[PDB]
């Protein structure tokens, strides 16, 4: 739709890629497996990149010249989850990497001599402060900016 | 949300307590001139019958080629020199007693004064002021978008969403 061309529903250049290129894959008139039970170009590796026919799903997917598919993601016509869908995902996953970074850390500096407890690991991954992340509804999105890490501590 | 509670003195207050809104009194009387302009329709029903419309030949053409060209530059050029009259006088004041740049008058009791021309009470100018400002800025954008047409309502509902 946008700058490159249209998706899969038609994309000539893209088609030619399917075809030569892979299929030459072929390329081996035979090469012996008439019945034989190993050499697997034969089945999929092609067909797994191939039966990926005039279907790939359908994904929209813009495809420029040479018909390799370009990613817009401007949240329109079709292309939204080529960044946000896998974007918030990157956010949510990290941040629950370091929410617990700022956790199997802010749980130590106390009691008795706490000077490298960390070259070994107290609860592995933290396996205690663990889920604190999925057990973030809202969380740092409020309690980070109000209290605890409070400007005070700023 | 600019008057979302914030401001101290010469800047904060000082600039505005009447001062800027007393200068925003002009805004209202400009929008009294402009709402002395729009009322061209202003009312349904009376004639014009038919006022300087779409350029046919200005005031009286002049015995000689009109100075630049158009009605606009000749009526314009002057306006911004013959009105600098007021703002000169409006920008020579001070609030308490007036002498020169005198001895020492900052604060004892009575506390300076109040916008020179304060509220003096009648806190009703402002209640109509921001009322007018809110209009000029506000749904005056009912007629500040694509108003190539005019008045011709024909029954249905009201409103039209985001567009264009």
């Amino acid at each position: 739709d946008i700058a490159g061309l249209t998706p899969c529903k038609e994309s000539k250049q893209f088609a030619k890629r399917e075809k030569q290129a892979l299929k030459k894959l072929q390329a081996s008139l035979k090469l012996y497996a008439d019945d034989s039970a190993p050499a697997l170009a034969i089945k999929a590796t092609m067909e797994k990149t191939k039966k990926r026919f005039d279907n790939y799903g359908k994904y929209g997917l813009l495809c420029g010249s040479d018909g390799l598919p370009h990613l817009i993601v401007s949240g329109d016509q079709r292309h939204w989850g080529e960044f946000i869908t896998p974007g918030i995902l990157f956010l949510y996953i990290a941040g629950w990497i370091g929410w617990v970074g700022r956790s199997y850390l802010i749980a130590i500096r106390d009691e008795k001599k706490p000077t490298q407890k960390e070259i070994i690991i107290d609860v592995p991954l933290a396996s205690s402060l663990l889920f604190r992340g999925f057990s973030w509804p809202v969380a740092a999105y409020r309690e980070l900016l109000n209290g605890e890490l409070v400007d005070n501590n700023f | 949300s600019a008057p979302g509670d914030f401001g101290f003195d010469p800047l904060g207050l000082g600039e505005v307590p009447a001062n800027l809104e007393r200068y925003k009194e002009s805004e209202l009387i400009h929008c009294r001139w402009a709402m002395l302009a729009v009322p061209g329709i202003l009312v349904p029903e009376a004639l014009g019958y038919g006022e300087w419309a779409a350029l046919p030949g200005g005031q009286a053409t002049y015995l000689g080629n009109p100075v630049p060209w158009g009605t606009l530059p000749t009526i314009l050029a002057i306006e911004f020199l013959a009105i600098a009259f007021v703002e000169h006088q409006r920008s020579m004041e001070k609030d308490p007693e007036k002498k020169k740049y005198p001895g020492g008058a900052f604060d004892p009791l009575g506390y300076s004064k109040d916008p020179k021309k304060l509220e003096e009470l009648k806190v009703k100018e402002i209640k109509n002021g921001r009322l007018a400002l809110l209009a000029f800025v506000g749904f005056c954008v009912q007629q500040s978008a694509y108003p190539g047409t005019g008045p011709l309502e024909n029954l249905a509902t009201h409103l039209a969403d985001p567009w264009h």
Partner: protein
């Protein structure tokens, strides 16, 4: 420092608004189930009044209502920093004045209060969730379906369907 919580105000009021709107949300469904036949998205419109005009549009509707919801909501704001709502039965509850053995701070667990006659915001506790998580449920299962329960002929037994989408 603030040992620990906290909060309070906070998001206990956080909930009840979930609770009591998940409750309503499901009045939504209630309808099409006994004398049944009529719903899903049914992207309503939503009940629709008279034969004297609309007509697809006359207007965004929907879009407005909630300009309203909007300053009424600033109002509940307009409450919870500084306690103001006559009844006073969400912010802690009613039973006028009280509960606020947690309004000036120092909770830990604090259970609460609030019916004069009589009992509580409690077994309105647990209709409280039944319905939040219900929705979770409710617009869980669409994304493939939309109906409950006949008899023992051939319905309630799950016969054949069709992944997730995939």
């Amino acid at each position: 420092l603030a040992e620990d919580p906290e909060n309070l105000r906070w998001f206990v009021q956080a909930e009840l608004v979930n609770g009591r709107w998940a409750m309503l949300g499901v009045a939504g469904m209630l309808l099409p189930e006994v004398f049944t036949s009529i719903g899903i998205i049914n992207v309503p419109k939503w009940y629709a009044a008279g034969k004297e005009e609309y007509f697809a549009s006359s207007s965004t509707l929907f879009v407005i209502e909630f300009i309203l919801s909007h300053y009424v909501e600033i109002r509940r704001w307009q409450d919870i920093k500084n306690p103001g709502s006559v009844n006073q039965d969400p912010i802690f509850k009613q039973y006028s004045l009280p509960a606020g053995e947690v309004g000036y701070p120092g909770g830990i667990f604090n259970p609460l209060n609030f019916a004069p006659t009589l009992e509580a915001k409690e077994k309105e506790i647990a209709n409280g969730r039944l319905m939040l998580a219900f929705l979770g449920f409710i617009i869980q299962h669409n994304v493939t379906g939309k109906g409950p329960f006949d008899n023992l002929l051939q319905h309630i037994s799950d016969p054949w369907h069709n992944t997730i989408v995939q």
